[PDB]
Ligand binder design. Structure first.
Ligand SMILES: Nc1ncnc2[nH]cnc12
Lengths: 231, 234
């Protein structure tokens, strides 16, 4: 079994890279893939760029060069649901674009032609991710994650996202792109995001402070999930 | 031929005329995309039908580059005209592409710029020059300038107003070009957009697009065929 790992948090990618045995590096397209074994399981690891095109490029390269059986995609996100807490981990049931609009031709908002309205994560991977998160004494929240190429963290902007996607739990900038690529290649995936900030609430942590702890937690989550899936 | 010319269009309607002219055609079907390889009027080509929007274009461009290794990429198809001199069927040539719907201005970036990328992607000067020579040879009306891309079909109202405000130099709007430019940038592959106008991105753009997609496909195809031949030998 070969597990592909795409992470947004630099420190998580660095820690995982350091842990990989028999490491090799594939360098191309302004992207880099690290391959080897993580605690005995073959993996392929990439740090996602920023925004949908960069994320899609990376995902496509990882799939074509490494042919993993599944994708685990980690990072951080903004929480849209007021019931979230900083440090909660959202597990995607589905991902949608908050900035796609071909409604002039009758499509649902967020849906692109030739795509479903939302890209669904794999039921087995969702369940496995949730179980691993909970085993690490963290809180897993299943729900819709929305993505787009605008960084949105202010009250007005988050309220607009919430009006268009009232069921959305979290927002960030790469999840839907990675899900779209995986979907189109028929590769099962799960998206996991640690909640850095909740809409209209001031976090007790700076983003850097959050990343210092979240990246360590996410690294452990990945190691745990890789082991559960393979062994 | 010395050069292998990569060509990317989003829709069936945009690729169908070129596809039917490929000799020794083979089809690669991967990741939701279709790639057609062979010769167009003796010139080696690799024609991608990407699907619509930025991720589809990025995915497809990546596959085209990896499987076919074209020397250059031409993005063709339809576009919404923003410059005042553009009629339906007229040609637009990129000098540069930008995302109209990217915003990380909170971190000090230019509007439309994403981290790790220039604010705009410069199209290749030789490709632009070649496109312009073709325009003159074919006696067509054209505009060279900034083309902006996003995952929205622009249909007047605030969507159009936002583009005109943020990118008053944009001559056309579409849904793939900048994504392709971004992938090409990452691999240092020369790129140019040569599209034709289907609509003017106004309140009636959906009706105009429906009616005139075929005309835009015809004119963009004529341009692309002519340009392929001009580029065949380096
Ligand atoms: N009005 C429009 N908006 C976005 N993409 C387009 N492609 C063709 N016309 C368009």
């Amino acid at each position: 079994m070969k597990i592909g790992i795409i992470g947004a948090m630099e420190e998580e990618v660095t820690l995982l890279r350091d842990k990989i045995d028999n490491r090799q590096t594939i360098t191309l397209g302004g992207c880099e893939i690290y391959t080897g074994q993580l605690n005995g399981t073959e993996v392929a690891l990439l740090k996602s760029g920023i925004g949908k095109v960069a994320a899609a490029l990376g995902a496509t390269l990882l799939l074509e060069h490494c042919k993993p059986d599944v994708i685990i995609n980690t990072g951080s996100a903004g929480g849209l649901a007021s019931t979230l807490k900083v440090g909660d981990i959202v597990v995607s049931d589905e991902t949608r674009y908050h900035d796609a609009d071909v409604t002039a031709f009758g499509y649902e908002y967020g849906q692109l032609p030739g795509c479903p309205a939302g890209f669904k994560a794999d039921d087995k991977l969702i369940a496995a991710a949730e179980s691993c998160i909970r085993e690490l004494n963290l809180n897993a929240v299943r729900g819709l994650i929305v993505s787009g190429d605008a960084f949105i963290n202010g009250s007005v902007g988050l309220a607009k996202i919430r009006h268009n996607f009232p069921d959305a739990v979290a927002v960030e900038m790469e999840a839907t792109a990675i899900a779209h690529v995986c979907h189109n290649f028929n590769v099962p995936f799960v998206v996991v995001r640690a909640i850095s900030d909740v809409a209209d609430q001031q976090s007790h942590l700076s983003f850097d402070e959050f990343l210092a702890v979240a990246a360590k937690q996410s690294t452990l989550m990945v190691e745990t999930l890789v082991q559960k899936l393979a062994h």
